[PDB]
């Protein structure tokens, strides 16, 4: 049997006559080496998507890069960084390297402060532009504590009148397609 992956030490325990092992959905995930009688676990090689965080072209020209669900160490080997241009290579390593629940973030600096969410990254983490790209934990709003008491009430002495818009779509264009002319022509 043939495949590609990462072989590691195992903790499970075959019976003296099995060779390999499957799981639900019938994917092989363990194996026994014919010359040592040792069980090895199989793990897929890392793969994922890459996304770009930008503050808008008209505002700035900087970017940050997110490699989703990857340990934030093998990014320069994940992408063939030594093959890319010297301008890609500055986004495969550097001083600003951050590990989030959503992946590996390159090009933005972590901050202990908290603001309103601007660009969603995930798992509570957002990013924005403050002149430099920053990444932070979003805040749900300003705190407040009403002065509750058992014989105290608050009553308004003035009012305002406000106007608010709301937009709803009701229809789309009526389109027709004659199959025979589309297929044969």
């Amino acid at each position: 049997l043939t495949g590609t992956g990462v072989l590691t030490e195992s903790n499970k325990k075959f019976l003296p006559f099995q060779q390999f092992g499957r799981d639900i959905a019938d994917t092989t995930d363990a194996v026994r080496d014919p010359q040592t009688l040792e069980i090895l676990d199989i793990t897929p090689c890392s793969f994922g998507g890459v996304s770009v965080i930008t503050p808008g072209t008209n505002t700035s020209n900087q970017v940050a890069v997110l490699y989703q669900d990857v340990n934030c160490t093998e990014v320069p080997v994940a992408i063939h960084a030594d093959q890319l241009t010297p301008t890609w290579r500055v986004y495969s390593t550097g001083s600003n390297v951050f590990q989030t629940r959503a992946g590996c973030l390159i090009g933005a600096e972590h901050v202990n402060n908290s603001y309103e969410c601007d660009i969603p990254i995930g798992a509570g983490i957002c990013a924005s532009y403050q002149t430099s790209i920053i990444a932070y934990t979003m805040s749900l709003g300003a705190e407040n504590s009403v002065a509750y008491s058992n014989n105290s009430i608050a009553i308004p002495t003035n009012f305002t009148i406000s106007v608010t818009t709301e937009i709803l779509p009701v229809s789309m264009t009526k389109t027709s397609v004659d199959c025979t002319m589309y297929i044969c022509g």
């Binding site: 014989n151 608050a154 009553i155 937009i167 709803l168 779509p169 229809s171 789309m172 199959c179 022509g185």
Partner: protein
């Protein structure tokens, strides 16, 4: 980006049509995308195989397009039903359902038309400039308990008044903005004052 909801529908429909048209340029496994080249450059009884390859590819593309269109038309129909309900219920009347017609206490609404949709302008009353007072649930007088008809009892530190609940406008406590029920023993929090008889 105000009209993004209206613009996305147009963008999605146009993109779906472009994808459908672009699919007319794929081999799907045959020699060429053009029927004429398959016909001229080949023999009748064996050109049918390539023709069938093209037939299946194009038919499948059409199927996916139509299914997407049905799924999206369902959503547009739901949105149009909501818009019709809002027109009937915020424009031709005054609504009590909170947050249905704007944010605050609804007064009225006006419609405007947009290329494939509708815009509502909701007019609303928002309370403002709050002050804090001391209050009580009932007033004791003559060994009887008095409750307000359509307001609350408030005190500016020294004197007691009756006011409506959404706008400060104090008044003298009288026996016609107040009703009596029971004696002064069961309510907890009752206070002592005088109820002027007119």
């Amino acid at each position: 980006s105000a009209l993004g909801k209206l613009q996305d529908v147009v963008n999605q429909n146009a993109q779906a049509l472009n994808t459908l048209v672009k699919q007319l340029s794929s081999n799907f496994g045959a020699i060429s995308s053009v029927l004429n080249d398959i016909l001229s450059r080949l023999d009748p009884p064996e050109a049918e195989v390539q023709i069938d390859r093209l037939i299946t590819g194009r038919l499948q593309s059409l199927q996916t397009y139509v299914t997407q269109q049905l799924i999206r038309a369902a959503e547009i129909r739901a949105s149009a039903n909501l818009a019709a309900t809002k027109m009937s219920e915020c424009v031709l009347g005054q609504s009590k359902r909170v947050d249905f017609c704007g944010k605050g206490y609804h007064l009225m609404s006006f419609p405007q038309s947009a290329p494939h949709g509708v815009v509502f302008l909701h007019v609303t009353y928002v309370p403002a400039q709050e002050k804090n007072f001391t209050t009580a649930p009932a007033i004791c007088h003559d060994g009887k308990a008095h409750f307000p008809r359509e307001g609350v009892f408030v005190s500016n530190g020294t004197h007691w008044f009756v006011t409506q609940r959404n706008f400060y406008e104090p008044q003298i406590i009288t026996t016609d903005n107040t009703f009596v029920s029971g004696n002064c023993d069961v309510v907890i929090g009752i206070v002592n004052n005088t109820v002027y008889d007119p």
